[PDB]
Short mmCIF file of all heavy atoms in Angstrom, two decimals:
data_model
loop_
_atom_site.label_atom_id
_atom_site.label_comp_id
_atom_site.label_asym_id
_atom_site.label_seq_id
_atom_site.Cartn_x
_atom_site.Cartn_y
_atom_site.Cartn_z
N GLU A 377 0.67 -2.05 -7.69
CA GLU A 377 -0.54 -1.99 -8.49
C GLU A 377 -1.28 -3.33 -8.46
O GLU A 377 -2.51 -3.36 -8.43
CB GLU A 377 -0.20 -1.61 -9.93
CG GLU A 377 0.25 -0.17 -10.10
CD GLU A 377 0.90 0.08 -11.44
OE1 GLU A 377 1.81 -0.69 -11.83
OE2 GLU A 377 0.51 1.05 -12.12
N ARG A 378 -0.54 -4.44 -8.47
CA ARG A 378 -1.17 -5.75 -8.40
C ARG A 378 -1.87 -5.95 -7.06
O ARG A 378 -2.98 -6.49 -7.00
CB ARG A 378 -0.14 -6.85 -8.64
CG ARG A 378 0.51 -6.84 -10.01
CD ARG A 378 -0.48 -7.12 -11.12
NE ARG A 378 -1.11 -5.90 -11.61
CZ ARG A 378 -0.60 -5.12 -12.55
NH1 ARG A 378 0.56 -5.41 -13.12
NH2 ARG A 378 -1.26 -4.03 -12.92
N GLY A 379 -1.23 -5.52 -5.97
CA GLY A 379 -1.87 -5.62 -4.67
C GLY A 379 -3.04 -4.66 -4.52
O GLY A 379 -4.05 -4.99 -3.89
N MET A 380 -2.91 -3.45 -5.08
CA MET A 380 -4.02 -2.51 -5.04
C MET A 380 -5.24 -3.06 -5.76
O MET A 380 -6.38 -2.80 -5.35
CB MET A 380 -3.59 -1.17 -5.65
CG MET A 380 -4.60 -0.06 -5.46
SD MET A 380 -4.13 1.44 -6.32
CE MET A 380 -4.29 0.90 -8.02
N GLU A 381 -5.03 -3.82 -6.83
CA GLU A 381 -6.15 -4.45 -7.52
C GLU A 381 -6.84 -5.47 -6.63
O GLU A 381 -8.07 -5.64 -6.70
CB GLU A 381 -5.66 -5.11 -8.82
CG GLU A 381 -5.20 -4.13 -9.89
CD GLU A 381 -4.42 -4.80 -11.00
OE1 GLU A 381 -4.34 -6.05 -11.02
OE2 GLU A 381 -3.88 -4.08 -11.87
N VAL A 382 -6.08 -6.17 -5.79
CA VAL A 382 -6.68 -7.19 -4.92
C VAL A 382 -7.43 -6.53 -3.77
O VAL A 382 -8.52 -6.98 -3.39
CB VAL A 382 -5.59 -8.16 -4.42
CG1 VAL A 382 -6.17 -9.09 -3.37
CG2 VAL A 382 -5.01 -8.94 -5.58
N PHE A 383 -6.87 -5.47 -3.19
CA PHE A 383 -7.56 -4.78 -2.11
C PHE A 383 -8.84 -4.12 -2.60
O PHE A 383 -9.87 -4.17 -1.92
CB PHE A 383 -6.64 -3.74 -1.47
CG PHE A 383 -5.77 -4.29 -0.38
CD1 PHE A 383 -5.60 -5.65 -0.22
CD2 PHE A 383 -5.13 -3.44 0.51
CE1 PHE A 383 -4.80 -6.15 0.79
CE2 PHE A 383 -4.33 -3.93 1.52
CZ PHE A 383 -4.17 -5.29 1.66
N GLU A 384 -8.79 -3.48 -3.77
CA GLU A 384 -9.96 -2.78 -4.30
C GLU A 384 -11.14 -3.73 -4.50
O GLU A 384 -12.30 -3.30 -4.43
CB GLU A 384 -9.58 -2.12 -5.62
CG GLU A 384 -10.65 -1.57 -6.52
CD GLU A 384 -10.09 -0.79 -7.69
OE1 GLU A 384 -8.87 -0.82 -7.89
OE2 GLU A 384 -10.89 -0.16 -8.39
N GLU A 385 -10.85 -5.00 -4.74
CA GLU A 385 -11.89 -6.00 -4.96
C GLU A 385 -12.58 -6.40 -3.66
O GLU A 385 -13.81 -6.52 -3.62
CB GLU A 385 -11.28 -7.21 -5.65
CG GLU A 385 -12.22 -8.38 -5.83
CD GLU A 385 -11.55 -9.54 -6.53
OE1 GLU A 385 -10.34 -9.43 -6.83
OE2 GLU A 385 -12.23 -10.55 -6.78
N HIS A 386 -11.81 -6.61 -2.59
CA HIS A 386 -12.35 -7.19 -1.36
C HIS A 386 -12.60 -6.17 -0.26
O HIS A 386 -13.42 -6.44 0.63
CB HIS A 386 -11.42 -8.27 -0.82
CG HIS A 386 -11.29 -9.47 -1.72
ND1 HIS A 386 -12.32 -10.36 -1.91
CD2 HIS A 386 -10.25 -9.92 -2.46
CE1 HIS A 386 -11.93 -11.31 -2.74
NE2 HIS A 386 -10.68 -11.07 -3.09
N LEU A 387 -11.92 -5.03 -0.27
CA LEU A 387 -12.01 -4.07 0.83
C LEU A 387 -13.36 -3.37 0.82
O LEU A 387 -13.75 -2.75 -0.17
CB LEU A 387 -10.87 -3.06 0.71
CG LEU A 387 -10.04 -2.69 1.93
CD1 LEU A 387 -9.41 -3.89 2.58
CD2 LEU A 387 -8.97 -1.69 1.53
N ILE A 388 -14.09 -3.46 1.94
CA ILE A 388 -15.37 -2.77 2.04
C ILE A 388 -15.21 -1.27 2.21
O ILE A 388 -16.19 -0.53 2.07
CB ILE A 388 -16.22 -3.30 3.22
CG1 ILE A 388 -15.52 -3.02 4.55
CG2 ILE A 388 -16.52 -4.78 3.03
CD1 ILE A 388 -16.39 -3.27 5.76
N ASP A 389 -14.00 -0.79 2.51
CA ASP A 389 -13.73 0.63 2.62
C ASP A 389 -12.78 1.11 1.52
O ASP A 389 -12.05 2.08 1.71
CB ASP A 389 -13.16 0.97 4.00
CG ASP A 389 -11.87 0.23 4.31
OD1 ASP A 389 -11.26 -0.35 3.40
OD2 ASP A 389 -11.45 0.23 5.49
N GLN A 390 -12.79 0.44 0.37
CA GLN A 390 -11.85 0.79 -0.69
C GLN A 390 -12.09 2.23 -1.14
O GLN A 390 -13.20 2.59 -1.54
CB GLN A 390 -11.96 -0.20 -1.87
CG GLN A 390 -13.19 -0.09 -2.75
CD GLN A 390 -13.00 0.85 -3.93
OE1 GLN A 390 -11.89 1.04 -4.41
NE2 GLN A 390 -14.09 1.45 -4.38
N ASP A 391 -11.07 3.06 -1.00
CA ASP A 391 -11.13 4.46 -1.40
C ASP A 391 -10.04 4.70 -2.42
O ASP A 391 -8.87 4.42 -2.16
CB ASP A 391 -10.98 5.38 -0.18
CG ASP A 391 -11.34 6.82 -0.50
OD1 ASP A 391 -10.72 7.40 -1.41
OD2 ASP A 391 -12.24 7.36 0.17
N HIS A 392 -10.44 5.21 -3.59
CA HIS A 392 -9.53 5.40 -4.72
C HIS A 392 -8.21 6.05 -4.30
O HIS A 392 -7.13 5.51 -4.55
CB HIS A 392 -10.23 6.23 -5.80
CG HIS A 392 -9.45 6.36 -7.07
ND1 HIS A 392 -9.22 5.30 -7.92
CD2 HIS A 392 -8.85 7.43 -7.64
CE1 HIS A 392 -8.51 5.71 -8.95
NE2 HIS A 392 -8.27 7.00 -8.81
N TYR A 393 -8.31 7.19 -3.61
CA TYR A 393 -7.12 7.95 -3.24
C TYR A 393 -6.39 7.35 -2.04
O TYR A 393 -5.16 7.43 -1.98
CB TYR A 393 -7.50 9.41 -2.96
CG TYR A 393 -7.93 10.17 -4.19
CD1 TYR A 393 -9.09 10.93 -4.19
CD2 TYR A 393 -7.17 10.13 -5.36
CE1 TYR A 393 -9.48 11.63 -5.32
CE2 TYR A 393 -7.55 10.82 -6.48
CZ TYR A 393 -8.71 11.57 -6.46
OH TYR A 393 -9.09 12.26 -7.59
N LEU A 394 -7.11 6.75 -1.10
CA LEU A 394 -6.47 6.26 0.12
C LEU A 394 -5.74 4.94 -0.12
O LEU A 394 -4.60 4.76 0.33
CB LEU A 394 -7.51 6.09 1.23
CG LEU A 394 -8.36 7.33 1.58
CD1 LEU A 394 -9.29 7.07 2.77
CD2 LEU A 394 -7.47 8.53 1.84
N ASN A 395 -6.39 4.00 -0.80
CA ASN A 395 -5.78 2.71 -1.12
C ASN A 395 -4.49 2.91 -1.91
O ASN A 395 -3.46 2.31 -1.61
CB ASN A 395 -6.79 1.90 -1.92
CG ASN A 395 -6.65 0.40 -1.79
OD1 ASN A 395 -6.07 -0.24 -2.65
ND2 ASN A 395 -7.19 -0.14 -0.70
N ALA A 396 -4.54 3.76 -2.94
CA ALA A 396 -3.38 3.99 -3.80
C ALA A 396 -2.27 4.71 -3.06
O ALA A 396 -1.09 4.40 -3.25
CB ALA A 396 -3.80 4.78 -5.04
N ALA A 397 -2.62 5.69 -2.21
CA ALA A 397 -1.59 6.43 -1.49
C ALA A 397 -0.90 5.56 -0.45
O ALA A 397 0.33 5.59 -0.34
CB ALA A 397 -2.20 7.67 -0.82
N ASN A 398 -1.66 4.76 0.30
CA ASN A 398 -1.05 3.88 1.29
C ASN A 398 -0.31 2.71 0.64
O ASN A 398 0.60 2.15 1.27
CB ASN A 398 -2.10 3.36 2.27
CG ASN A 398 -2.56 4.42 3.24
OD1 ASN A 398 -1.99 4.60 4.32
ND2 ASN A 398 -3.60 5.15 2.86
N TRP A 399 -0.66 2.34 -0.59
CA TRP A 399 0.10 1.31 -1.29
C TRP A 399 1.44 1.84 -1.77
O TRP A 399 2.46 1.16 -1.67
CB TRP A 399 -0.72 0.75 -2.46
CG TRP A 399 -1.49 -0.48 -2.10
CD1 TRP A 399 -2.84 -0.58 -1.92
CD2 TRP A 399 -0.96 -1.79 -1.87
NE1 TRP A 399 -3.18 -1.87 -1.60
CE2 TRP A 399 -2.05 -2.63 -1.57
CE3 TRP A 399 0.33 -2.33 -1.90
CZ2 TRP A 399 -1.88 -3.99 -1.29
CZ3 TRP A 399 0.49 -3.68 -1.63
CH2 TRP A 399 -0.61 -4.49 -1.32
N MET A 400 1.45 3.07 -2.31
CA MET A 400 2.71 3.72 -2.65
C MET A 400 3.55 3.99 -1.41
O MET A 400 4.78 3.98 -1.49
CB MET A 400 2.44 5.02 -3.40
CG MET A 400 1.83 4.81 -4.77
SD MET A 400 1.68 6.35 -5.70
CE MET A 400 0.38 7.17 -4.78
N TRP A 401 2.90 4.23 -0.27
CA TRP A 401 3.64 4.41 0.98
C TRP A 401 4.34 3.12 1.39
O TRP A 401 5.55 3.11 1.63
CB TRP A 401 2.68 4.88 2.08
CG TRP A 401 3.33 5.18 3.41
CD1 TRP A 401 3.96 4.30 4.23
CD2 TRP A 401 3.36 6.44 4.07
NE1 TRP A 401 4.41 4.94 5.36
CE2 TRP A 401 4.05 6.26 5.29
CE3 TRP A 401 2.88 7.72 3.76
CZ2 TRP A 401 4.27 7.30 6.19
CZ3 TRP A 401 3.10 8.75 4.65
CH2 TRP A 401 3.79 8.53 5.85
N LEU A 402 3.58 2.02 1.48
CA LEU A 402 4.15 0.76 1.95
C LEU A 402 5.19 0.22 0.98
O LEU A 402 6.14 -0.46 1.41
CB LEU A 402 3.05 -0.27 2.16
CG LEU A 402 2.52 -0.41 3.59
CD1 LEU A 402 3.63 -0.87 4.53
CD2 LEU A 402 1.91 0.89 4.08
N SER A 403 5.04 0.48 -0.31
CA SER A 403 6.03 0.04 -1.29
C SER A 403 7.22 0.97 -1.39
O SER A 403 8.09 0.75 -2.24
CB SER A 403 5.37 -0.11 -2.67
OG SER A 403 4.69 1.08 -3.04
N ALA A 404 7.29 2.00 -0.54
CA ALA A 404 8.36 3.00 -0.56
C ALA A 404 8.51 3.64 -1.95
O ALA A 404 9.62 3.92 -2.41
CB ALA A 404 9.69 2.40 -0.09
N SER A 405 7.38 3.87 -2.62
CA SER A 405 7.39 4.53 -3.92
C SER A 405 6.95 5.98 -3.85
O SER A 405 7.14 6.71 -4.83
CB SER A 405 6.49 3.77 -4.90
OG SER A 405 6.92 2.43 -5.06
N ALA A 406 6.39 6.42 -2.73
CA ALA A 406 5.95 7.80 -2.55
C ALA A 406 5.69 8.03 -1.07
O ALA A 406 5.32 7.10 -0.34
CB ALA A 406 4.69 8.10 -3.36
N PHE A 407 5.93 9.27 -0.63
CA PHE A 407 5.66 9.72 0.74
C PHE A 407 6.57 9.06 1.78
O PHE A 407 6.87 9.67 2.81
CB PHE A 407 4.19 9.49 1.11
CG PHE A 407 3.22 9.96 0.07
CD1 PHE A 407 2.36 9.07 -0.55
CD2 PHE A 407 3.16 11.30 -0.28
CE1 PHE A 407 1.46 9.50 -1.51
CE2 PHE A 407 2.26 11.74 -1.24
CZ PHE A 407 1.41 10.84 -1.85
N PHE A 408 7.00 7.83 1.52
CA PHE A 408 7.82 7.05 2.45
C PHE A 408 9.06 6.56 1.73
O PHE A 408 8.99 6.13 0.57
CB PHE A 408 7.02 5.87 3.02
CG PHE A 408 7.75 5.09 4.08
CD1 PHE A 408 7.78 5.55 5.39
CD2 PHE A 408 8.39 3.90 3.78
CE1 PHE A 408 8.44 4.85 6.37
CE2 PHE A 408 9.05 3.19 4.76
CZ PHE A 408 9.07 3.66 6.06
N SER A 409 10.20 6.60 2.41
CA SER A 409 11.47 6.25 1.80
C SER A 409 12.29 5.24 2.58
O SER A 409 13.27 4.72 2.03
CB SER A 409 12.32 7.50 1.57
OG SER A 409 12.84 7.97 2.80
N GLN A 410 11.95 4.96 3.84
CA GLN A 410 12.78 4.10 4.69
C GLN A 410 12.55 2.64 4.31
O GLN A 410 11.79 1.90 4.93
CB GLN A 410 12.47 4.36 6.16
CG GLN A 410 13.36 3.61 7.13
CD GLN A 410 14.83 3.92 6.92
OE1 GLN A 410 15.54 3.18 6.24
NE2 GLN A 410 15.29 5.02 7.51
N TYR A 411 13.23 2.22 3.24
CA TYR A 411 13.08 0.86 2.74
C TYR A 411 13.88 -0.16 3.54
O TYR A 411 13.70 -1.36 3.33
CB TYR A 411 13.49 0.78 1.26
CG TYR A 411 14.88 1.31 0.96
CD1 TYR A 411 15.98 0.46 0.95
CD2 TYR A 411 15.08 2.65 0.69
CE1 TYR A 411 17.24 0.94 0.67
CE2 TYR A 411 16.34 3.14 0.41
CZ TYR A 411 17.42 2.29 0.40
OH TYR A 411 18.67 2.78 0.13
N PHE A 412 14.75 0.28 4.45
CA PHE A 412 15.46 -0.64 5.33
C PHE A 412 14.58 -1.16 6.46
O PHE A 412 14.96 -2.12 7.13
CB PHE A 412 16.71 0.02 5.91
CG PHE A 412 17.79 0.27 4.90
CD1 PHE A 412 18.03 1.54 4.42
CD2 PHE A 412 18.58 -0.77 4.45
CE1 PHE A 412 19.03 1.77 3.49
CE2 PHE A 412 19.58 -0.55 3.52
CZ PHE A 412 19.81 0.72 3.04
N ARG A 413 13.44 -0.52 6.70
CA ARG A 413 12.48 -0.97 7.70
C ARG A 413 11.55 -1.98 7.04
O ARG A 413 10.62 -1.61 6.32
CB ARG A 413 11.70 0.21 8.27
CG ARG A 413 11.36 0.09 9.74
CD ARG A 413 10.00 -0.54 9.94
NE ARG A 413 9.76 -0.85 11.35
CZ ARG A 413 9.87 -2.07 11.87
NH1 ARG A 413 10.20 -3.11 11.13
NH2 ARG A 413 9.63 -2.24 13.17
N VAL A 414 11.79 -3.27 7.29
CA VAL A 414 11.04 -4.36 6.67
C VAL A 414 10.39 -5.18 7.77
O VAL A 414 11.08 -5.72 8.65
CB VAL A 414 11.94 -5.24 5.80
CG1 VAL A 414 11.13 -6.37 5.17
CG2 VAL A 414 12.62 -4.41 4.72
N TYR A 415 9.06 -5.28 7.73
CA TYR A 415 8.34 -6.05 8.74
C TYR A 415 8.62 -7.54 8.56
O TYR A 415 8.78 -8.03 7.45
CB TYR A 415 6.84 -5.79 8.64
CG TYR A 415 6.44 -4.35 8.86
CD1 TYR A 415 5.91 -3.59 7.82
CD2 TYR A 415 6.57 -3.76 10.11
CE1 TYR A 415 5.54 -2.27 8.02
CE2 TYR A 415 6.20 -2.44 10.31
CZ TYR A 415 5.68 -1.71 9.27
OH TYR A 415 5.31 -0.40 9.47
N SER A 416 8.68 -8.25 9.69
CA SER A 416 8.90 -9.69 9.66
C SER A 416 7.57 -10.42 9.70
O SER A 416 6.79 -10.22 10.64
CB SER A 416 9.76 -10.12 10.84
OG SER A 416 9.73 -11.53 11.01
N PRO A 417 7.25 -11.25 8.70
CA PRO A 417 6.00 -12.03 8.75
C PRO A 417 5.98 -13.08 9.85
O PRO A 417 4.95 -13.74 10.02
CB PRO A 417 5.95 -12.68 7.36
CG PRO A 417 7.37 -12.77 6.94
CD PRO A 417 8.03 -11.53 7.48
N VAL A 418 7.06 -13.23 10.61
CA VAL A 418 7.14 -14.20 11.68
C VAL A 418 7.09 -13.53 13.05
O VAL A 418 6.41 -14.02 13.96
CB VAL A 418 8.42 -15.07 11.54
CG1 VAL A 418 8.60 -15.96 12.75
CG2 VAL A 418 8.36 -15.89 10.26
#
């Protein structure tokens, strides 16, 4: 929710349903469950 607030502010394509759904996806809170798959920032 904190990240969704930041994206909604700056994203020129901020879509109520899309931003929230893809945020729940990436946080493994909905639609997606494979939390062992963690991207490396390096």
Side-chain angles (χ1 to χ4, degrees):
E377 290 166 310
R378 297 295 89 86
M380 189 185 68
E381 292 166 7
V382 172
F383 273 15
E384 167 173 9
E385 174 179 2
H386 295 290
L387 226 56
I388 64 169
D389 59 13
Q390 73 90 28
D391 192 302
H392 187 69
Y393 291 131
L394 305 184
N395 208 261
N398 287 271
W399 266 107
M400 293 185 290
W401 183 296
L402 264 298
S403 53
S405 301
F407 312 119
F408 186 81
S409 73
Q410 185 57 264
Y411 55 93
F412 291 104
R413 215 268 171 258
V414 180
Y415 299 113
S416 166
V418 173

